[PDB]
Scaffold this active site. Structure first.
Site, PDB file in Angstrom:
ATOM      1  CB  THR A   1      -1.228  -5.674  -3.041  1.00 23.14           C
ATOM      2  OG1 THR A   1      -2.195  -5.462  -2.215  1.00 23.14           O
ATOM      3  CG2 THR A   1      -0.998  -6.501  -1.912  1.00 23.14           C
TER       4      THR A   1
ATOM      5  CE1 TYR B   1      -6.432 -17.912   6.948  1.00 27.73           C
ATOM      6  CE2 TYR B   1      -7.526 -16.038   8.662  1.00 27.73           C
ATOM      7  CZ  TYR B   1      -6.815 -17.332   8.169  1.00 27.73           C
ATOM      8  OH  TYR B   1      -6.408 -18.286   9.116  1.00 27.73           O
TER       9      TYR B   1
ATOM     10  CE1 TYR C   1      -6.006  -4.153  -4.652  1.00 28.12           C
ATOM     11  CE2 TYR C   1      -5.347  -3.175  -3.377  1.00 28.12           C
ATOM     12  CZ  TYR C   1      -5.170  -4.284  -4.288  1.00 28.12           C
ATOM     13  OH  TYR C   1      -3.721  -4.609  -4.537  1.00 28.12           O
TER      14      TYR C   1
ATOM     15  NE  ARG D   1      -1.767 -11.344  -4.448  1.00 28.85           N
ATOM     16  CZ  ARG D   1      -0.414 -11.128  -4.400  1.00 28.85           C
ATOM     17  NH1 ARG D   1      -0.279 -10.786  -3.281  1.00 28.85           N
ATOM     18  NH2 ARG D   1       0.645 -10.695  -5.068  1.00 28.85           N
TER      19      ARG D   1
ATOM     20  CE  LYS E   1      -4.533  -1.413  -6.758  1.00 28.29           C
ATOM     21  NZ  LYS E   1      -4.058  -2.136  -6.317  1.00 28.29           N
TER      22      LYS E   1
ATOM     23  CB  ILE F   1      -3.990   1.810  -9.332  1.00 29.45           C
ATOM     24  CG1 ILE F   1      -4.554   3.084  -8.447  1.00 29.45           C
ATOM     25  CG2 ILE F   1      -2.912   1.736  -7.922  1.00 29.45           C
ATOM     26  CD1 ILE F   1      -6.072   3.079  -7.023  1.00 29.45           C
TER      27      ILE F   1
END
Ligand SMILES: [Cl-]
Ligand SMILES: [Cl-]
Ligand SMILES: [Cl-]
Ligand SMILES: [Cl-]
Ligand SMILES: [Cl-]
Ligand SMILES: [Cl-]
Ligand SMILES: [Cl-]
Ligand SMILES: [Cl-]
Ligand SMILES: [Cl-]
Ligand SMILES: [Cl-]
Ligand SMILES: [Cl-]
Ligand SMILES: [Cl-]
Lengths: 292, 292, 292, 292
Positions: D44, D107, D133, D138, D161, D203
């Site tokens: 990202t 999305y 992740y 997001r 993560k 991370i």
């Protein structure tokens, strides 16, 4: 009677946090002269939390005495204990109020069946019309439309002040109640939208400082003149927003002082005097509305 | 003194909603026998909302009398009016309680400066240690770490029950206060995590029905035996979750009844008896912990 | 042209996840026969995420070919990279589509100024009308009314699909744009409320399985027949709710299969076939609407 | 290898938004010299969204070439289409990376079973260790601990993560996975707390501008020296906060420029250059950390 611009009236206080009769007289004369439909006495905006039952009763009876039959009065009678709510309800039987505004229990978070048992038990101890009051941001309890539907079957449960600003609640509730069940906005920034969707008025903080404009907007909205109502709404939108720049009623009490309607904007702890930032916001909003 | 497993004790009631002294005696004997560090009398779990100031006083005094010096008692003294909080605080000065648990004002949503003035005023009217209590899900008011930090500088404000389950707040608060300031979990499902991060105990709902397991978990956590403490946490996690399947204290009062600790799980309106769905969930959680 | 019931059309697939032309023909014939105003080809409901740019182009072109001028087609052209959005936009210029539906960038969370520059750049590389699409639940990005207002001043940006279900946004947006700017609901459960407040239609998931009912509801709403429109809304409310019992378009693809409109309800990973729980809910909703 | 301070490295760009090899060399030499455990390439923070697969591959292979075996590289390989994720995965087989960081589909909002099928299919097409992740803010998709537990049974799914900042996830996940499953923080402000609870590293965005301090903090935390680690955390907390004053990676790319690590802080639209307000915040935070 329970339509149009209903003011959630501030409880004006002197420097000592005691009720100011001179200021309360000025406020009630203002509402009589500016088209306000009714006064809600000692709601959230009236600092229900920091007045004893005795002081609460005194403010409602002083409001009735100063109104002198010129404008109807609705008593705030909410409590988070059913016993306490019944006690407040019995206090206002044959007082002269036209009804009671009763909030969902706060802090203790009853179930929907608890809400049903609470309001059923209250409604049993009076002939007075009861207006339910949903404001989950403050209470931690959300009375859902299904529960409102169940309570609407009780004769003297006549309406709801829906303060969520969730405009889908208007027809979610209308679908489950008879046509004469009264829907009132308790969220100033969405009041106009609420009335456009079929709500019949507002129980309003903005009405404290913009009585004439709010009365005009509600009359036009109820008459289906939405464009004309919204032009007034746009003049008031800075007030609808900035009267919550600090928690209600900190801004609106300063607003009333700024207009000369009250001698002081004193509140009872833990509520605090408006900050400089807050004062600047309310000043700008009052000017935008053409009131300063 | 304010460390380990502190029970937020239920107020046991008969079928008519009157306090049951026989049940209160059994509860207090159970906590003395099973390693509980202290009793919070008439907190949220104790139905503070539906007791009068007078009944509230009677429950605390009866708790002190039955405890008979065997276990310390903390008085619930929270109110959403500063004047009311001071009056409650004065009622318990010289009572024999070791401290007060005082919640952020609910429903009226004061500013952070309002919270500061509220708890400052309370602290000035007492000799007793004060434990702040933050539970914004119930109150509509979130006391931020910055505000806890300001209040920690007042002599008699000695700690906080942080019930958000936001574990970032342990070190956000510790950074702003002396090493002496007491951090206690008010969120049972994150209490173990809270202690591993440096919290010194829990004011617990789960302790009502699993006193021995909660006392062992807090002892092992404070000793740095995190693996052993977490194995107890896993035995209790269904209780930590399912004791909130309906709003606290509906589930835990049924749990106390199921273990024979109280005669009836009666609550006061607007709180209601546990549903069949709730009863089944709490039964399964108690069996998972090996307690039925 | 951008008014009434606009279907967010499913991309029908065979058992191997390849686009089914036979099923796409049946879908397009169904929309022509049942009053649908336009087709959005390869929006969210069309699985834009799991089609290549090349397959995306093929589905839009096949939709145009089968439509054969009988119903207008809007291309889904959204991307979270401005360069990629421009490339998609250029692919459909001179294709025969009447406009583009372009979602706020997802995952990378641009600022409001970033959204402004994104849609400005897209609008500068096309002659086609652009419909903004705001769905922060999916994107992590909320395009605010102020930003819609700034973009509405760009010639080719003609409207917005507002999918938040926040009905305050109808007049918050209308206040900042010309009367010509098109407001469309992207939230089926609030689409009726959105039109009653002044929205001019819906880009609808429900229209996939109830085209006639959605066309009638939008027609009656635009004609000011709110009572008649709301009676249709109540027949469809179980579909408006249960078509999101699992993430769109898992439920609606099964619904299309159940009505015989597509051969298979296959989706592309990571989207999965409807669960038994989902199938039962959608079956009950379709039966409530009188469609099974 | 997958422990300590792992940098989510920025993708440095020239004025034209093209990858800057001179700047990428400076960054990688900086991480080699300052104790960083590994580089995540094109996560990202590395603007995965605005790079083509070709440019993405080029950045990872350039990162490997400049690392020259001095520091391990992990490839960002996330996509919201399973086909696309497999394509990126196959691209990096025998590339020289030590593993892949693969985000939950964004999305399109798959179900938990969709997440399981997505990551299972990806893991089948490589021998490379896979780090899951989760960043629902997001993506619009929250991979729950139960799903992480199911995926941890697959041989080359080795860690996660966890970017939620929900610190209860550490032991919720540890309870359902073997002791050697790797837990890494993806939330800089709670990284220290995450490691104190048993996480084995971060991370990190902060590591881009504070590599030495982050490497030291992670070493001390992993060694159980929590007090010493937290003193470093407090020096970095303004960076942990203000590197998200605008959406990541807008602030951190300006931070890298301010330290002379990159020639320009250019990003690809829709991401935008840092505002003056943002620049002032990052400057103050860098100074507080003693780095300017
Ligand atoms: Cl009275
Ligand atoms: Cl509310
Ligand atoms: Cl709404
Ligand atoms: Cl308006
Ligand atoms: Cl809380
Ligand atoms: Cl645990
Ligand atoms: Cl949304
Ligand atoms: Cl309806
Ligand atoms: Cl490559
Ligand atoms: Cl997140
Ligand atoms: Cl947390
Ligand atoms: Cl810290």
């Amino acid at each position: 009677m329970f339509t149009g611009s209903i003011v959630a009236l501030v409880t004006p206080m002197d420097e000592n946090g005691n009720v100011c009769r001179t200021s309360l007289k000025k406020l009630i004369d203002y509402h009589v002269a500016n088209g306000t439909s009714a006064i809600v006495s000692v709601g959230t905006t009236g600092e229900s939390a920091t007045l004893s039952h005795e002081e609460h009763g005194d403010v409602v009876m002083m409001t009735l005495e100063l109104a002198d039959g010129r404008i109807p009065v609705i008593a705030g009678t909410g409590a988070n204990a059913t016993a306490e709510a019944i006690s407040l309800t019995k206090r206002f039987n044959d007082s002269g109020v036209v009804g009671c505004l009763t909030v969902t229990p706060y802090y203790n978070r009853p179930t929907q069946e608890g809400l049903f048992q609470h309001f059923k038990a209250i409604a049993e101890h009076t002939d007075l019309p009861q207006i339910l009051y949903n404001v989950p941001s403050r209470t931690g309890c959300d009375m859902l439309p299904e529960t409102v539907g169940r309570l609407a079957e009780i004769k003297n449960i006549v309406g709801i002040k829906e303060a969520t600003g969730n405009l889908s609640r208007v027809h979610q509730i209308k679908e489950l109640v008879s046509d004469d069940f009264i829907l009132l906005s308790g969220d100033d920034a969405t009041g106009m939208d609420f009335m456009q969707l079929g709500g019949v008025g507002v129980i309003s903080v903005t009405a404290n400082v913009a009585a004439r404009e709010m009365a005009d907007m509600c009359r036009l909205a109820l008459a289906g003149q939405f464009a004309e109502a919204r032009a007034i709404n746009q003049r008031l939108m800075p007030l609808h927003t900035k009267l919550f720049v600090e928690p209600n009623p900190i801004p609106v009490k300063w607003g009333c002082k700024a207009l000369g309607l009250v001698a002081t904007d004193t509140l009872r702890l833990p509520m605090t005097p408006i900050t400089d930032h807050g004062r600047e916001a309310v000043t700008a909003a009052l000017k935008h509305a053409g009131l300063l």
